[PDB]
Design an enzyme around this catalytic site. Structure first.
Site, PDB file in Angstrom:
ATOM      1  N   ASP B  32      44.242  32.207  32.078  1.00 34.80           N
ATOM      2  CA  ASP B  32      44.599  33.118  33.163  1.00 34.80           C
ATOM      3  C   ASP B  32      44.773  34.506  32.657  1.00 34.80           C
ATOM      4  O   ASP B  32      45.826  34.813  32.087  1.00 34.80           O
ATOM      5  CB  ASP B  32      45.954  32.661  33.779  1.00 34.80           C
ATOM      6  CG  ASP B  32      46.412  33.533  34.979  1.00 34.80           C
ATOM      7  OD1 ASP B  32      45.552  33.961  35.785  1.00 34.80           O
ATOM      8  OD2 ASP B  32      47.609  33.778  35.241  1.00 34.80           O
ATOM      9  N   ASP B 228      40.671  39.172  36.478  1.00 32.24           N
ATOM     10  CA  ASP B 228      41.573  38.014  36.614  1.00 32.24           C
ATOM     11  C   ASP B 228      40.812  36.666  36.674  1.00 32.24           C
ATOM     12  O   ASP B 228      40.320  36.258  37.711  1.00 32.24           O
ATOM     13  CB  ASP B 228      42.432  38.181  37.902  1.00 32.24           C
ATOM     14  CG  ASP B 228      43.517  37.120  38.047  1.00 32.24           C
ATOM     15  OD1 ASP B 228      43.797  36.362  37.094  1.00 32.24           O
ATOM     16  OD2 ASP B 228      44.154  36.993  39.106  1.00 32.24           O
TER      17      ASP B 228
END
Ligand SMILES: CN(C(=O)CC[C@@H](C1CCCCC1)N1Cc2cc(Oc3ccccc3)ccc2N=C1N)C1CCCCC1
Ligand SMILES: CN(C(=O)CC[C@@H](C1CCCCC1)N1Cc2cc(Oc3ccccc3)ccc2N=C1N)C1CCCCC1
EC number: 3.4.23.46
Lengths: 385, 385
Positions: B32, B228
């Site tokens: 992440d 992201d």
């Protein structure tokens, strides 16, 4: 009779007991004015206490149609049917309505929650899969002489609700077909529903313990502004959010706290005996009135925007979420706004009335208020297209 | 070696095998770049295949601190510790790092998913509970001679991933400490990380099959623009979203479809043999280059923004989500952008490089591209404050 027919949590929503099928199957159903489907658990998902067993009902009829409802990384999906529905603590009548039998879901059901479906009380035009699927409340009005309105008093009061304090500390009222004067004080003031999809209203001015935000008022309703019992927070478009944030920040210098608190990325915490309510400003929304050039204001406290989240070690540490936040969906008047007031969804007259709730949380210094009339101009161009 | 070390789903993210404690406990951990905590399941939540058992590890050390991370109606919460971590298909080294042992959560874990924790590779300043909690990758660089950069190739390719096609159809690569030339074609073009918190970058111009959106470019990065890997969609601020939406709408008149599709409130569906890719425009983002007055563009196809959602009756009906959406958090370059490219997170040089991925999905008419240099002015005032 219908007084006190709602339980559960500001934070996990409010649910009403319903029956579906013959013989009648009892389910807890979340009351949701931000959506338009009636949809119930139909299979044994581990988080559910119970679920609709079509096998067991003679009045069930298949519509041979599926429906799929994505939301924010989650979904639900179901098969469309009709059956006979009642509300035990509601008007004594029975309707045949659409039911989406939910058969797969993600991030829909909540573990620990005690409700097992949703009642969408808003309008067809946002009914999935399309507007032809007639919403429950329409159906309830077509098939009976129950009047075309309901009202809500959302409380969530005494001391923190749980799972035998979700059952046994019942948090508000849904009055179907009517209005009960015992649930409010002063008078109802009424704002027009701008369009029958969600319960869209136009907000025309915002103030924080007195101080206008002197923004275009097109930006208070950017995209849209709605009344939504399925939402916990007061939600505000970026520009208004940032702007409100800054003046809530300014009004609040009295004491001080971190950046990410304001953005709901960390939560806030002080001692008990020691809640500092005064250093927080009132919030005031003005809404469009029933008359040209005329508005009214509703006013809420931090009691309702600083809202307890479930203790560190059920101790005396007090920990709450800033209940205001951002959106790209418009302004969302959720439980923070609603628990201040008795709210009347007057669908026949195309309007929403607000009065000061007889159960709202306050003190002795301040209070929630509904006040008018005020003079405000260029009110319908606060809208958006 | 580290090639192909990632599995799982564009849609349920990408996960790497890690080990924690002594002896080593294997877990799948989501990669992440939009967050900064290393956090793993620590208790038997029903959706998890496995979980960190501190009891079993000699190198575990308690930090006697809790952490609580609210997000959008969901949360996780944990207790902070340190232990010894390795990555079997990564650089041959072992680090002591912070670990948040997750002990309660809502709408965090995903049922059906096969990962059990998250690796936040972004910066301290967004580490919960505060910036003093040193992020894994910082720790991995302080304690070893592994260079201060990683790169990612996110594929998610052949035919739909599942749970033995999540295990056995491995969807990309994380190269820790380096860059592998086999994973891309042409050259890397590099945009500066504007600030070390998230991987913020400035987007300076947007085009749809050729056509500028002639908006202030302050509005492409309103609030912020970020890269992201934990996000599936291309996400765009309201004004840019609505504006992009309209011209994606216009470019696309060739054939036609409903309102709520564009808003992710219903999903889209045609026959197989019969995907209509051409009637969809390319999207082009220009980003700030390493030099004054100079930009480069990356270009993606609908292959990557119209992204398969798991079939009606695994039939020939083809059903996808419009993978672009709204935000009040800024622009979010998620898997739709990333699966187009090899992405190099060059933390030592404070920049992000993009090249055309050697595994990206395309055809024979078009392709994903990285191209420059372009002349663009007033580039840093595309930022926001
Ligand atoms: C937890 N819930 C919500 O957060 C509802 C969000 C709320 C929206 C309405 C439009 C303005 C922005 C706030 N909604 C939308 C909504 C979505 C929905 O579909 C799914 C599907 C899968 C997972 C989650 C939601 C269903 C009902 C909706 N009603 C709203 N008020 C839900 C929790 C279920 C009870 C409704 C609120
Ligand atoms: C499903 N996940 C997300 O949707 C992540 C959203 C994404 C944000 C980052 C900032 C720009 C807007 C998109 N995040 C934030 C994030 C939040 C987070 O905390 C919770 C807590 C409870 C429930 C859900 C999230 C944890 C990690 C985050 N990393 C992001 N990229 C998650 C699924 C877990 C893997 C991370 C993405």
């Amino acid at each position: 009779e219908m007084v006190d027919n709602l339980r559960g949590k500001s934070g996990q929503g409010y649910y009403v007991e319903m029956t579906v099928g013959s013989p009648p199957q009892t389910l807890n159903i979340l009351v949701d004015t931000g959506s338009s489907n009636f949809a119930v658990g139909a299979a044994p998902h581990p988080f559910l206490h119970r679920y609709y067993q079509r096998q067991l009902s003679s009045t069930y009829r298949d519509l041979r149609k599926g429906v799929y409802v994505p939301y924010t990384q989650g979904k639900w999906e179901g098969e469309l049917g009709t059956d006979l529905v009642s509300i035990p603590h509601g008007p004594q009548v029975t309707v045949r309505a659409n039911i989406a039998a939910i058969t797969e879901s993600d991030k829909f059901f909540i573990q620990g929650s005690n409700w097992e479906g949703i009642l969408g009380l808003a309008y067809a035009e946002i009914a999935r899969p399309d507007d032809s699927l007639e919403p429950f409340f329409d159906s309830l009005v077509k098939q009976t002489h129950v009047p075309n309105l309901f009202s809500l008093q959302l409380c969530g009061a005494g001391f923190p609700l749980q799972q035998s304090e979700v059952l046994a500390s019942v948090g508000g009222s849904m009055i179907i077909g009517g209005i009960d004067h015992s649930l409010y004080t002063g008078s109802l003031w009424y704002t027009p529903i701008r369009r029958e999809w969600y319960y869209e209203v136009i907000i025309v001015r915002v103030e924080i313990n007195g101080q206008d935000l002197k923004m275009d008022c097109k930006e208070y309703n950017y995209d849209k502004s709605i009344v939504d019992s399925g939402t916990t927070n007061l939600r505000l478009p970026k520009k208004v959010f940032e702007a409100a944030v800054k003046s809530i920040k300014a009004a609040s210098s009295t004491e001080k706290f971190p950046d990410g608190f304001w953005l709901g990325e960390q939560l806030v915490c002080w001692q008990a005996g020691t809640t500092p309510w005064n250093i927080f400003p009132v919030i005031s929304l003005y809404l469009m009135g029933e008359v040209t050039q005329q508005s009214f204001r509703i006013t809420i406290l931090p009691q309702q925007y600083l809202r307890p989240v479930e203790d560190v070690a059920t101790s005396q540490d007090d920990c709450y979420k800033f209940a205001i936040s951002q959106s790209s969906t418009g302004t969302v008047m959720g439980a923070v706004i609603m628990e201040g007031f008795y709210v009347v969804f007057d669908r026949a007259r195309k309007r929403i009335g607000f009065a000061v709730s007889a159960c709202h949380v306050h003190d002795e210094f301040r209070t929630a208020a509904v006040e008018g009339p005020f003079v405000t101009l260029d009110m319908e161009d606060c809208g958006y297209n």
